[PDB]
Amino acid sequence: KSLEEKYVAVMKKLQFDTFEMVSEDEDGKLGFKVNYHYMSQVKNANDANSAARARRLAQEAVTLSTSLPLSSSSSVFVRCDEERLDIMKVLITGPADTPYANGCFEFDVYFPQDYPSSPPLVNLETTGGHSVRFNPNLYNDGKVCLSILNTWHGRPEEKWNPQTSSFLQVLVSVQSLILVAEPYFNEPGYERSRGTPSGTQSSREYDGNIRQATVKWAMLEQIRNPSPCFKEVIHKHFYLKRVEIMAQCEEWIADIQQYSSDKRVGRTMSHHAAALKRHTAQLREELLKLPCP
Amino acid sequence: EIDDALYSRQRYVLGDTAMQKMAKSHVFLSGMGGLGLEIAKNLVLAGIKAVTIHDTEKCQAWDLGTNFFLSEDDVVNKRNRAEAVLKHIAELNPYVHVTSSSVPFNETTDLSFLDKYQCVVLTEMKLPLQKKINDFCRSQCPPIKFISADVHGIWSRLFCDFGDEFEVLDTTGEEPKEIFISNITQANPGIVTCLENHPHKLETGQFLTFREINGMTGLNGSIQQITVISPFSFSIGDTTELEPYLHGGIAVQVKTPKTVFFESLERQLKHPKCLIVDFSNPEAPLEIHTAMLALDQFQEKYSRKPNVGCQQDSEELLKLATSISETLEEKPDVNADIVHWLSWTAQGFLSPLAAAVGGVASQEVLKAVTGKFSPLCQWLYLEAADIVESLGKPECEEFLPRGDRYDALRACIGDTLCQKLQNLNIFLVGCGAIGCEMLKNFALLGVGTSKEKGMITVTDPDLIEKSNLNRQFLFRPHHIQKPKSYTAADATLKINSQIKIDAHLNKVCPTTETIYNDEFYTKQDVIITALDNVEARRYVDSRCLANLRPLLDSGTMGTKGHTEVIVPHLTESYNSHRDPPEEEIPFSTLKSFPAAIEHTIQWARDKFESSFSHKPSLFNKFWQTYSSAEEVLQKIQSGHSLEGCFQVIKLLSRRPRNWSQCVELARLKFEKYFNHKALQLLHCFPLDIRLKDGSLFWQSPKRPPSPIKFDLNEPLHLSFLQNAAKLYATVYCIPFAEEDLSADALLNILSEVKIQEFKPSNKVVQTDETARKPDHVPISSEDERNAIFQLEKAILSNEATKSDLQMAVLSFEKDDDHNGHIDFITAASNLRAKMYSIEPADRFKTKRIAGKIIPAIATTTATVSGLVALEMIKVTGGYPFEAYKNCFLNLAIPIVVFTETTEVRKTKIRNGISFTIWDRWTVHGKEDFTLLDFINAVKEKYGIEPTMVVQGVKMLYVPVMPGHAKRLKLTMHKLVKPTTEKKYVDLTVSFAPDIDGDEDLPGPPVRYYFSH
Ligand SMILES: O=P(O)(O)O[C@H]1[C@H](OP(=O)(O)O)[C@@H](OP(=O)(O)O)[C@H](OP(=O)(O)O)[C@@H](OP(=O)(O)O)[C@H]1OP(=O)(O)O
Ligand SMILES: Nc1ncnc2c1ncn2[C@@H]1O[C@H](COP(=O)(O)OP(=O)(O)OP(=O)(O)O)[C@@H](O)[C@H]1O
Q: Phosphoserine-modified residues are where (chain B)?
């Protein structure tokens, strides 16, 4: 619990901060010092900014600086440009007891011109070159599907609301819906297989694949190739949680080996377990080589 | 036969039944002043078969200020007024047989020759002669419709008399309404309840007909008269004897004919039925009628109009008005100011008011020969007293004539206001019909004719089309496919050679903001918009609000029109209005469950776009992104997920190579669209399937689809096949001839084509009316290997050249009939309607709806242009807020409503300080001036401390942002990093609310200057 308290104390000071992601030349043409998803959208945005687009963003900044979620199980970290508020990056640590447990994911956030009349645009960058569709609502291309973002089917009350919806609500919905312990059932049609042996078997297949992919990208590629906006955050988080990470990966290796005897899916479990062991050895080496922040 | 290519916009207003009656009507028009010329022009543009203009007066120099066809040569030759303009009028519409006459009119004149005319219009005629003619006209069998119109200075009079009884065939231009029935009870009277989500929107006493009613099957085909109970219920009479209701039911509104009564002109002078146009003065029209009757009696008594500034004439006119007023039924008090101004401006002639009255009178004439709308009953008085009321008591020397062409307007508004008008700089956006009429009004008023300052700038990018000749009267058949702005500018100078006009082809948009910068807007004094869309209106309104310049706006939808007046520091801007947008049809309703013909039309339009605009563009883009099909094969074999590769492969594998294959593809598309879809939907939802509550799924608004069987003998099937084949051949660049379109060839070609047997898939059907179109379905491995095989076969068959990998893209042309886009859309929509038992539409309605063609007529455009030009005078004169009048009119009823423009709403910010949308705070600084200095200066100047500073999209300073308190010490130039072009910069500021946790209160925009 002392580790939890230290994580709360340290990462809280690192939850919200500025970062120089955008610079302009002598004429004013935009040039970016970090990777970003909406390059064309940013470069094509006009200067006819609505006052609401600034007031709402300032109020959201106050709300984020005051009440960003924070726990060693799951936390939200936000970085915004020193000059442009409409561009942001969001780093989320996966809640425990899920295939995303302790995995850190980087998101690119853009605000459209008519914001807050329309939901903002969020894209995922931790897909590992679009290799893995980490969630049924999170396609490998980086698309994020949510009712509040109008990118997922739902009732109007679940949709975007310029008067009541907020970015904090979006983050809470992301944590509560995408990073769940049963991502396989998020897909339509698959949710009705919940409780059936075939549905549970397919869920275990998907969860093993997601676990190995998370270890590969959301942990190993993050420590090896950290994003500059979250470099200190990622190192501190992995150093603080390192023992839990190795324990969790050994537990996952033990869990996936339980289904290696399966004939429908067992070979996939064997392949994912071999990949997980390789990535676990690599992660253990990296954590042993990781200096104390 | 109606020339649709010329008349379509007017047809969408009037209808074929009315137009086929106007083709057999003769109209007699007397008096060729400004008002008579406007009426004649509107009637000729409308397409009346025969018009007989008549006038006995000769041309004078005074006439040039009211007539836009006369020339100085006409005055030199002393030609007859009617014959001097007969030649020019005929050019407006070659289909119209215009004639001229000059028979003297007086007491001894024989009126028997008038019987050959259906309608008679009299202008600038003595009252007793009008009385005699009206007595003769209404006594004929059938009665001759009588209309009288007059303009005296700033006062106008319009009168109608359509006989003892007039049979109106349609009380309004609204389409008949369809009401879906939710429940009906067996009661006396039976209470009918519509679907609870849609309002009743009907009135007691109307007639409805019923169809598709289950349970009470006897109500099918019956006609009932309803009584409104609630905004969602009504009663149609006793239904207890009927069967028990089950479900369904649709009621249709029936347009019953209505009879309107009129009275003789001589008796109508007492107790006149006057149309109220200003509800703040419900008794003004009666006073105006009394004053005009007194003026006519003065003309009878003295054989001359009152002289301007003559107190004796004004006193005599007041005495006559007082004597006349007591004879009326109501005995109103004589308005001294109205009589005084009528005496003051008796000899004047205000052109914009004349144009507005001419438009209204022409609409009444069109109603007279068709009965398409409820006519005026009976008097209508339009005022312009606001123009001269703000002048106080100007001297008579301002109004005395001086010999130039502007004596007509000088006697109306005085010399100083005319001088102000001549020095105006007006930026006219859009050169449509409203723009052309406004340019004609400018030419008549002499706007910008001063050699020192006056200048008019008109900009429009569109070219002249044949359909524009119907209402944009400045153009001619030989001006087709030439710029609107250039042609209008070159035509305007003929009306008034002293005018100075500049024409531009630029579209008004942010991309062209460089030309129309703030310095240009500062130069202009008034901005007038004749736009046809909303986005450009909002952009122009924002620019005018930024530059603090008045704006005049107007728009016409058929017989409805409105005028918007915006004045700095006085009225709200156009952006302050946020009326609800067009309601989108639900995606599930459009794709799967259409209820009305409009849904099928929209579906056909979307299908056409996706088939000939979207997918060919994607094909071209895909084959330009990747060079060769072999490269695509190598990439997909290595797992590369090229953007939409499988769809492009599917398009490539189905590419036709000759006309026969195009016909086969069209046949397959017909089968897929109109047989397989219905079978799939019925497989998902059988006819007897029931919901969770046990109610039948197939009930209103949903309708059960029926599979259609192909049959080449039916004209609709042949039309669809021909259109689809031609469009696909054009897209695939397959050459063809008209002989290939013969039904014999199509039958011979299709005889060898096998029709694939249908199989039911299990695709999810979206029944949610709140859902939208889902994104791409994940491609299965089977589809992947099928695409691989298809493109490998294509490569083997050498179908991989650049010609194979490019397709022509078709734009949705709608004005031309030979391209066949409208034909294809009509055929597809009618077939889809036949699927769901929806009543089929026709080609013209499909053209109107699919093309989003806004109905328009010349009369409404002329009226709104006259009103806008009238308000332009008030804007130029700088009159107080009370003088400006927003207008909304609908000539169908007819109804004209004047209303004070919306007052600007002060927004309280803090501690009693308030600002308006026109406000903009300013701060002057220097290079060592800092952000903290900026905050201190703002707080000192306006008594309130800023809480955040924003430079457009860039954030300058927000307290909650870490490390931004350091920016207070930074110099303004360094933190802004501005360009040397601008001496200033615009920032957005917000302030602290009274309550903690509330959003920062938005302040007015702030302009900071980098130097003093
Ligand atoms: O592209 P869309 O305009 O949305 O229309 C598509 C398209 O039909 P067409 O190519 O004939 O216009 C599909 O065919 P493909 O291009 O994918 O071959 C067809 O899919 P099927 O071949 O499976 O019938 C689908 O129909 P559906 O969604 O019922 O499967 C239909 O959609 P709509 O006609 O409803 O637009
Ligand atoms: N942003 C803009 N800047 C300048 N002119 C514009 C702009 N948007 C529209 N227009 C002009 O508005 C005019 C509209 O004219 P109008 O309403 O009489 O109908 P139309 O476009 O000529 O014909 P129809 O609507 O019947 O096809 C067009 O001539 C077009 O050039």
A: 264, 700
